[PDB]
Each structure stands twice: as C-alpha cells, then as structure tokens.
C-alpha cells in the first residue's frame, strides 16, 4: 500500500526492517521501516511501547498534590511536569506567585535544560556519530592539536591527557567485556569521523559524565533532591532568610545562593568550551560527508508555546518566543493559544485508545484516556508476539496531537527556527538565538572547514537547519542560551531579595475552602524536548480531568485521522542506509529528537 502525504511518498512494498527495542532513549519504543531496492527508507512507523495511565490515576485527587504525581511522568526531564502542573493549578485558581518563586522556578527549568541537553548529546546521541573503536587508533598528539583548533579555551587538551584516556579505553575493550559498547556497529561506513575526532568526543563523553552530577545541585538546593525536586502550588518551598538567624536555619540564605552561582558559572564554561564546539565540529564533518538527511517536518511545520518572559506573566517578552510556522514560510509566525479548542487537539485513530468519535481530535480540556489495546487484521504475529505491526490500524500508545489539524515538529530546533523568524520580523527578545545561529552557520560553512583544511560551503540556515545535524545543533545552542539566561535570573533574584522582598509563596488560596467550586486551567512549559502542556479541570476541590500533551507525544505521534505522519516518521523518510540490518542512520535521526517515551505516553 502506498499513498502521498505532506510531500512524502509512503510505500510499504519494500523490505521491512524492525528495531525493537530502540535503545539510548528514555522509555520504550519500536520502530519499523520499509526500504527500497537501494536501501532508502520509503516508510516509517513509530510505536510507543509503554503506557502507565497517569491521567487516569490523577482523577479525584487534590490539585495541590498533582505536581508530585506528574513529575514521575519522567525522571530525565525531571521537574518539567511539576512546573506545568503548578502553573495549571495556579491558572485555574487565579493564583499569582511572588517574583522570587518565579525566578527560582526559571533557574530550575534552565538547569534542567542544560543537564538534559548535555547528557543527551554525549551519553545517548554521540555513539551515533562517534566510533569508539576508531578512537583506539587515534594519535594523542594529533588529538591534542585537534582539540586546540576545536576549542582553544578548553584547558584539558594535552597529548598526555588524551593518551591516558585512550589507554583506559583500550584496557577496557581488551578485557573482552565491552559493556555498553557490546555488539556495537563500529566500523560501519556510516561513521565518518577521523580517529582523532573520535578520541576527542569519547574523552568529552567521560568528562560530561563526571560533570553533570554537579549541575543538578542547583535543583537540590531549591528543590531538595535530583531527580524529582519538590515544587509547590503558589510558589516554592525554599523559604528565604539572609539574616544571621538564617545561618543554615532557612532553606535559602546567601551562602546557598553563592553556591548556586558557582554551579551556574561552571555550566556556562562547559557549554561554551566543550558542548557547543564539539557539536559544531562533528556537524561540520558530517556536513562535509553530505549527511544532511533527517529534516522531516522541520522543513515545513514547527510549533512551540513560547517561554521565558523577561517580565513575568507578559508573553510578548518571551526570550524563546513561540508560535507556529506552516509550509516552511518563515515570514509568518501564527500565534498559538493553548486555551483555543480549535488549536491543540489529539486524535487516537491510530493509537491504542478509544473516543466516542475517533474521526475528530479532542482539545485537552475535553480529553479522554481510555485504553484500547487492539491490533489490525494485517498484523504479522499475535497479540502478545508481534512480528510486524499493522500501521493501517492502531499501532501506538502515543496519541496524535495536531495544531489546527496540522502535524508539527516541536523541540529546540523548532524553538530556534521560531526565534530566527521572530528576530527577522523585528522581535528584539530573540536577538541572542539569531546571533547563535549566524555564528554557527559561519563556523560550519567557513571557519571550521578552513581550520581543518576542508572545502568551504555556502549553506544558508534555511538549507542547514532542517536536518538531523541542525536539530542536534539547535539543542546545543539552546543549552548555551539557557545557561546564559539563568545567570541573569540569579542576579535578578539576589537583587530582589536584597531590596527587601523575601516572599516565596502566595498562600491566599492554599485552602480549598477558598476555591471556586469549578475551575479550569492550563500550564505550558518549554520542556527540553519541546512544547509541554497540562490541562486541568477542578470540581469541588478535586481533579475532574487532567490531560497532558507532551513534546514527544507531538514528535513520536502515529498517523492521524487524515493519515498525516508525525515528526519521527517524516524524519526517517528519504534516508539511505549503509546496511539495512544495522540501524545506524535510523538511530542517529531518531536520537536527534531526544525521544522521551515515558513522557510521550504518560
């Protein structure tokens, strides 16, 4: 069976390839593709293979407790759901949180962004670009020289250092117990990096693993623990006391804030010196190899809610300004309203749920979550032993979100395309992302090629961004931007406190006896993986409905009623595989979305 949608020519007549489990993601996913006679992907099927039913579990519970339940949607994007939840409840109950609470939440959110992004790239994504076995062949001296060209400011660059790292790797591999490297696809022609680049990357993989545990201590200070820091409807629990009497007496004093600043400063150095330069260099080399596949929907339709207003509760001041772009027209950003029943809707036509009428999509305030695990008649295998999924029927635990009926990509890339479009339309708040993108284009086109003795290219951002390389780049740039932003947030927080405002919680409406007997609210967040929303209905002090639409719900969505494909499936289309039995290219592109499958299904 073959049909065309969104400019893609889907065809399932070719060779079927199954990847289950998809690894180096969060949670559980199955991916199937069909390839043509030349090993090009001509069909792709995204199956979310887990469900827990948080939306069902929340029913009847206290809205003030909800954040803790939904926080456990995901321990990777830990806290992003708690933030959405408290925002939703505060929206429903007309609660305005104090400035300090706003700033502390922002600092926690941006800390998550950096940690999530950096850990993703190195520990989940890098092994798609980096051949660790090749790293064993590298010359430490030439690796040192490469490091100095890639990032002159990074102090860990000596030949002796890279030699020591290489030696531990060799002992490890030569032990015969390869651990996480077991049965890898090393040696595949899909890997294009020179040995020295591979050794540099593996070195930073180990560095990042040691460093990431420091960054999250910001969460620990404000929220008690990481993973899963604590939040609060009405503000934050970390009360402030700078007086002498607040010497380790209060959750937050000046010593604690100084500690936080020190962590922020380290983050800024890592992003600037290690993460961004690495991605630029690896991107440049794969660009030179001509690997610009994986654009998918990014070339046409992107969406984000918009986040990080420099003035609280004033959306025009979002520093990651959002909206929707359609049809690749970057000259026109449409406003996105999470309250509009005609905008965000979820279909289940091809998902394992049931509606009263599955020909329509439901806005999340009217959302319904009733499981319906059933397989199509053309399934190969049985209900409990699937060999080939039937994508003509219901094939995923992920719902299908659409915006005004359109399939959209979400995530850092979407945010950066939107920021670029805003900036060109005269939006000053988007100046920094625009600067980052133009800098990156020059590095990838010209500066790094010249440094490495490679030919210069002349790709525009329009040509470069909608790609798996672009998607990976945008994530790194966003990490950097987030680090910079929370540096400013810290200064604003300390200034506010010293001016005499120490408030951290608004408790006027803490007691349910003060609530309206019915209410509805929505909270949105720029989560690490894209646009997150929680929609709540409250009745007689209890949760009547609670519906989440999460970034990987958008990206990993199965087909909708019209048969339109989502971002994952679109991104895999039109991609050649070196060897159909080694899913290197599939993993590289899927991983560029940073799939969070527990998030997607909740």
């Amino acid at each position: 069976s073959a049909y065309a949608t969104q400019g893609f020519n889907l065809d399932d007549r070719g060779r079927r390839i199954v990847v289950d489990p998809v690894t180096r993601i969060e949670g559980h996913m199955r991916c199937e593709v069909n390839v043509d006679a030349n090993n090009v992907i001509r069909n792709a099927v995204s199956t979310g293979t887990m469900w827990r039913g948080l939306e069902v579990i929340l029913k009847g519970r206290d809205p003030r407790d909800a954040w803790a339940f939904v926080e456990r949607i995901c321990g990777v994007c830990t806290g992003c759901h708690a933030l959405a939840s408290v925002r939703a409840v505060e929206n429903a109950l007309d609660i305005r949180i104090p400035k300090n609470a706003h700033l502390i939440r922002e600092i926690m959110a941006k800390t998550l962004q950096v940690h999530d992004h950096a850990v993703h790239f190195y520990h989940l994504h890098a092994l798609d670009w980096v051949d660790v076995m090749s790293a064993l062949k590298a010359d430490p001296k030439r690796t040192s020289e490469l490091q100095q060209l890639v990032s002159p400011a990074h102090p860990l660059s000596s030949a002796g250092y890279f030699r020591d790292i290489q030696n531990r790797l060799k002992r490890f591999v030569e032990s015969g117990q390869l651990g996480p490297f077991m049965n890898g696809y090393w040696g595949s022609k899909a890997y294009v990096l020179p040995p020295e680049a591979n050794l540099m990357a593996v070195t930073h993989y180990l560095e990042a693993l040691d460093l990431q545990k420091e960054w999250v201590k910001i969460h620990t200070i404000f929220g008690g623990k990481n993973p899963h820091p604590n939040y609060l409807v009405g503000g934050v629990p970390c009360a402030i006391n700078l007086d002498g009497i607040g010497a380790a007496s209060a959750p937050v004093n000046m010593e604690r804030l100084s500690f936080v600043k020190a962590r922020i400063d380290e983050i800024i150095e890592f992003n600037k010196n290690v993460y961004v330069p690495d991605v630029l260099a690896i991107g440049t080399l794969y660009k030179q190899a001509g690997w610009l596949y994986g654009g998918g929907l990014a070339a046409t339709n992107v969406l984000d809610y918009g986040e990080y207003p420099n003035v609280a509760y004033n959306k025009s001041t979002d520093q990651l300004p959002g909206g929707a772009i359609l049809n690749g027209n970057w000259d026109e950003v449409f406003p996105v309203d999470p309250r509009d029943s005609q905008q965000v809707q979820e279909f289940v036509s091809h998902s394992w749920y049931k509606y009263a009428d599955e020909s329509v999509g439901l806005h999340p305030w009217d959302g319904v979550t009733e499981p319906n695990y059933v397989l199509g008649a053309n399934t190969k295998g049985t209900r409990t032993r699937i060999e080939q999924i039937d994508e003509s029927a219901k094939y995923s635990w992920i719902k299908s979100p659409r915006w005004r009926g359109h399939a959209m990509e979400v995530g850092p890339l979407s945010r950066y395309i939107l920021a670029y479009a805003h900036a060109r339309s005269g939006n000053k708040y988007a100046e920094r992302p625009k600067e980052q993108l133009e800098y990156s284009a020059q590095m990838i086109n010209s500066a790094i090629p010249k440094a490495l003795g490679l030919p210069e290219t002349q790709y525009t951002l329009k040509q470069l961004l909608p790609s798996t390389i672009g998607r990976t780049l945008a994530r790194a740039l966003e990490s950097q931007y987030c680090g910079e932003m929370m540096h400013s947030d810290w200064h604003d927080l300390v200034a506010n406190i010293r001016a005499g405002d120490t408030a951290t919680a608004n408790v006027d409406k803490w007691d349910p006896a003060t609530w309206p007997l019915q209410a509805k609210g929505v909270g949105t967040v720029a989560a690490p993986r894209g646009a997150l929303g929680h929609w709540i209905r409250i009745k007689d002090g209890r949760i009547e409905n609670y519906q989440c639409v999460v970034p990987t719900t958008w990206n990993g969505s199965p087909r909708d009623y019209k048969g339109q494909i989502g971002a994952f499936e679109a991104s895999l289309m039109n991609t050649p595989m070196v060897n159909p039995e080694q899913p290197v290219e599939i993993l590289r592109t899927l991983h560029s979305f940073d799939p969070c499958l527990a998030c997607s299904t909740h």
């Binding site: 489990p21 003030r64 321990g75 545990k213 999250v216 604590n230 009405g234 970390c238 408030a503 803490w510």
Partner: protein, 270 residues
Amino acid sequence: PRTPVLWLHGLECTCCSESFIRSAHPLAKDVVLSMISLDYDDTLMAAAGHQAEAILEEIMTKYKGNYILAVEGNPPLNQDGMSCIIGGRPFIEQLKYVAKDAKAIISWGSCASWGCVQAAKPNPTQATPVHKVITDKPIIKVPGCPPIAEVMTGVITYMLTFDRIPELDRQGRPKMFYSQRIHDKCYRRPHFDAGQFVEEWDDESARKGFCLYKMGCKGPTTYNACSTTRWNEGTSFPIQSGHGCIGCSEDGFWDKGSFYDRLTGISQFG
C-alpha cells in the same frame, strides 16, 4: 573478570537510572569501567533491536548464575502485558526469562520494590512489583523515588566486594541504608520536640526552619537515609529545602492521602 549486570527497564520514568549516575562515591564512570560489566541497559547501550536482544542470551549462557539482574520499573499484567512491550512481547516475559539464571536481583526504586506511581489507584495497567512475579530468586529492595545515588552505588559496591546481598530487614531492604526513619535524625527534630511548626508556607516559622509535620511531612513513618546521607553529595534533602517528606520510599505512599495532610496522633512520634 567484572560481574555482568543486566539492567532491565519495565514501566518506569527512568529516575532510578538518572539517580545512579549522580553518584560521587563511587563515580558512576568508575562503576561501569572498573567494577561491573554493564552489558545490557536500554539507556546507555550502543546496540539496538536484534543486536541488543542477542546480548541477553550471550551473557546468560557465559555467566549463568553469576550475573546480577537489576530491574528498574515494573511489569504490567493488564492489557495482556502489552502496556509494556519489548521485542514485540510483554515485558513480564523478558523479566521472567532473565531472572531465572540470575545470581541476585536488585529491585531499583519504588517502582520495582512496591509499584510506585503507576500502581497508585486505580492502577490501570495492574503494574506489579518484581517480588510478586519473581518468587524463587534472591531479591533486594532498594526503595525510593528515586533512591539516593550513593545508596544505589553503595548496594552495588557491597555486593561486588563481598559477593553477598547485605543484611535485609523484614521488608527486604538493606539495613545499612534503611534502618532509620527520616524523623530519627532530621535536623528539624529539636523544633518538633518543642512543638515549633510551620503552619502556612513561607510564614515566619518556615523562614526559621521549623518542623514540617503540620505541613504533611511523612518523615516520622518513612525509612531512608535522606536526613543523614542526604542528596547529591550531601547537598540537601527535601526537608532541608523546605518541603515535607512525601514518604517516597514506603510501600503505597501515593495512596496515603494528600501529601499535605498531617499524620494523626502526633504523640506517637515523640
């Protein structure tokens, strides 16, 4: 020869894997490179699909009765088990297969130990803790949502050093980490003893770090190392940062009423 660990994932949020890599003593890097052989783990492993599955058989054969099975998350029994699918089959089938030849089984976190959030009412997937499906193997529960990083790596370190499971309490938790209630050594205890409590968020009492009992703190009924070992290299823990313990290491903590409802009979905790 480093002991192989097969780290399976059921229904989960992955908080337990994330906590593990926060460990400072020892570093996760050192655990993976020098202490264990982490041969199968969805989060970190290079191989996918058929290549990943092939690892399980290879290790189970070569290291029969001499690998550790670590389980994060839990198996669902509803939806014919297919609310958690791995390699086209129910997770429960993978769990039972790998468990059979394990030397020991670690139940990471409250998911694997007790059920955690997905097992909260009405438990639509019938998510079930590992010890209720695997009944004929040595198991150790390491509860918490997630457990403290150094508690996780502490358990691994003991098992590797001694080739034994550490002493367990009646609920199957290691006494070396879970012998104390939060409330035993909580630094706010002097306030509790003197009837000095926070009554509303960010009141004067909260700014003085008064006891959080009346704000719903479940420290008095919760066994964990949070008040002494603390979190993220001893940086803080929930109570230090101003929120009551929500009881996250205890069986069924999601269904013990609102987190903000105080325990009854305060006298019994004095």
